[PDB]
Design a protein around this ligand. Structure first.
Ligand SMILES: N[C@@H](CCC(=O)O)C(=O)O
Ligand SMILES: N[C@@H](CCCC[NH3+])C(=O)O
Ligand code: NA
Length: 484
């Protein structure tokens, strides 16, 4: 249970958590409020499960696109910043932390794709997609290709697909016309052999960092690898398409306040008047760079770095990453259509009209149940090898310490507190050392997993070996837990 009087913070391990902790040691100096910054593994998965019972951190830092799901579950507190504070952040960043017209988190950092180019190969990088074919032919006559970037993930081609507004098509005849024009141009690049349909993230990054291609498309997370390489690189605005800017998806690292937290007034003070200052954001940016930031005053000091300036410019011309869970199936279909077109599996027309989202969800939920139940194996080994063969909360019994999961049905066996609509895997032990861990799908599991009785079961043999068996369809299973 969250302890009143103190702030606990969760932030990913690739962020400046030591720098944030320095912001926080200052907070305890001007209060009596200790602060602790933790960077737990898989914190974005743990948070909804801990917060459901009133546990977890007071503040969580993560990309805004996850916070729509937390907000839908009522796990984030609505924040009410005064106008004086809101005017200190770029207006579009507040849009990323809105859910049902309510502010749900504080924007911190802003990321988007940019055009990265090798200054030695290409001192005059193109301002338009249209001129890339001719430049590719010229560079190849000089021993290099024009452009390599990840074509397997539509996130990377989206800036071109979303560029054309399609307003001109209306006058020649918003819907899908602009996306058709962008996709058709992408498909033509590939058929004319200016790009390969099989180019993925690893191939493109290796090519650019080895100096084999003049341009790539990537975000700030990729810069340090190019820094290590020999490449004299620059970062600039994405090229235009049909005279209109590329529109990349925008990710906004945001700080939400746990709705079960009893220190909401304490967290509001720390985030607004300490972290989101020029001083607070520098203490984190000194540790590990945030890229572009939502704070106007600090972002103006970072824009001297052309890489950071280009990131914010592309972000301001793009669109905020979708965060509405009710729209997830729509966007999964959009992703599927883009891959089918780019890969040449379908025409542009047929792709935008034709891999089930249910399969992705069912596989993910099965894998989650396998991992959730499997995480109890080491606990059970500790019990069995210390002679404890009864599950329970009393002394001398095996206390499972399970965490409730909203895709499972199963009451706690060792005194754990579960929220409604959650369950834990069910543990049985025997004096022989045999054991089972049975996770039964229920509550908010997919109908794909609830339409018949369906389980994932870890079985311990008396030699101490474990195996996993699923009664879900093999279509939704993995090698870790096959069907019988
Ligand atoms: N990273 C997810 C993305 C799927 C989605 O877009 O919903 C995957 O395994 O493909
Ligand atoms: N594991 C079961 C059975 C205990 C031992 C049965 N001989 C339980 O604790 O509920
Ligand atoms: Na080449």
């Amino acid at each position: 249970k969250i302890e009143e009087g103190k702030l606990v913070i969760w932030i990913n391990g690739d962020k400046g958590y030591n720098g944030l902790a320095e912001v926080g040691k200052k907070f305890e100096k001007d209060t009596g409020i200790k602060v602790t910054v933790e960077h737990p593994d898989k914190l974005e998965e743990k948070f909804p499960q801990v917060a459901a019972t009133g546990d977890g951190p007071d503040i969580i830092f993560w990309a805004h696109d996850r916070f729509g799901g937390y907000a839908q579950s009522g796990l984030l507190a609505e924040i009410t910043p005064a106008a004086a504070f809101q005017a200190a952040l770029y207006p579009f960043t507040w849009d990323a932390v809105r859910y049902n017209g309510k502010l749900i988190a504080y924007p911190i950092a802003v990321e988007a794709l940019s055009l990265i180019y090798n200054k030695d190969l290409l001192p005059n990088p193109p301002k338009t997609w249209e001129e890339i074919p001719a430049l590719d032919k010229e560079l190849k006559a000089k021993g290099k290709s024009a452009l390599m970037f990840n074509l397997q993930e539509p996130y990377f081609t989206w800036p071109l697909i979303a560029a054309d507004g399609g307003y001109a098509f209306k006058y020649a005849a918003v819907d899908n016309a602009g996306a058709k024009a962008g996709l058709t141009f992408l498909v033509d690049l590939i058929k004319n052999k200016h790009m390969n349909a099989d180019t993925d993230y690893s191939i493109a990054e290796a090519a650019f960092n080895k100096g084999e291609t003049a341009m790539t498309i990537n975000g700030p997370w990729a810069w340090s690898n190019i820094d290590t390489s020999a490449v004299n690189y620059g970062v600039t605005v994405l090229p235009t398409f049909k005279g209109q800017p590329s529109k990349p998806f925008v990710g906004v690292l945001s700080a939400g306040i746990n709705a079960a937290s009893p220190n909401k007034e304490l967290a509001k003070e720390f985030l607004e008047n300490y972290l989101l200052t020029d001083e607070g954001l520098e203490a984190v940016n000194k540790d590990k760079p945030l890229g572009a930031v939502a704070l106007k005053s600090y972002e103006e000091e970072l824009a001297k770095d052309p890489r950071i300036a280009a990131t914010m410019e592309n972000a301001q011309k793009g669109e905020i990453m979708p965060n509405i869970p009710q729209m997830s199936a729509f966007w999964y279909a959009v992703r599927t259509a883009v891959i089918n077109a780019a890969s040449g599996r379908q025409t542009v027309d047929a792709a935008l009209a034709a891999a089930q989202y249910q399969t992705y969800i069912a596989k993910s939920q099965v894998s989650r149940a396998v991992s959730e139940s499997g995480s109890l194996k080491t606990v059970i080994e500790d019990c069995l090898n210390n002679g404890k063969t009864t599950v329970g909360e009393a002394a001398g019994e095996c206390a499972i310490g399970a965490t409730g999961s909203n895709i499972l049905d199963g009451a706690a066996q060792s005194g754990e507190t579960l929220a409604a609509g959650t369950g834990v895997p069910q543990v049985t032990l025997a004096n022989t050392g045999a054991a089972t861990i049975v996770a039964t799908f229920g509550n908010s599991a997919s109908t794909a997993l609830k339409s018949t009785p369906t389980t994932v079961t870890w079985t311990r043999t008396t030699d101490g070996t474990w195996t996993c068996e699923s009664t879900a369809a093999e279509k939704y299973n993995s090698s870790a837990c096959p069907a019988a």
